[PDB]
Amino acid sequence: AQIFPRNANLLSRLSIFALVLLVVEGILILGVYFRSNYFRQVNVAIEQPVAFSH
Amino acid sequence: MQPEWSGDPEVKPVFLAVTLTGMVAFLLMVWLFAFYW
């Protein structure tokens, strides 16, 4: 009450919760990026110089 | 000695929320690292 508003309690608890969620989300994004199809070039039809069709 | 929050409507709800968050995180992590391939 001296230097903080009433909602500071909720703000601090939500900040901790959001920080944990953000760490988990960052880990998830890193893993997904490193396991993505764009990274590993999967299901991407690479264009060929002579356009051969199997 | 009772916990400071003892006798509060919000205690069960907050515990529940924390558990649900945790379960969701766990399942998602498990999927990405084990089943997504």
């Binding site: 939500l14 | 929320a17 968050t21 969701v24 998602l28 990405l32 997504y36």
Partner: peptide
């Protein structure tokens, strides 16, 4: 508050599903 925790969890879940779909797009 539990309501805000659940709302944040739902937002994080939606973001995680979008990211997961983006990987296999």
């Amino acid at each position: 508050l539990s309501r805000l925790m659940i709302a944040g969890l739902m937002v994080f879940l939606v973001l995680s599903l979008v990211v997961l779909l983006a990987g296999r797009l």
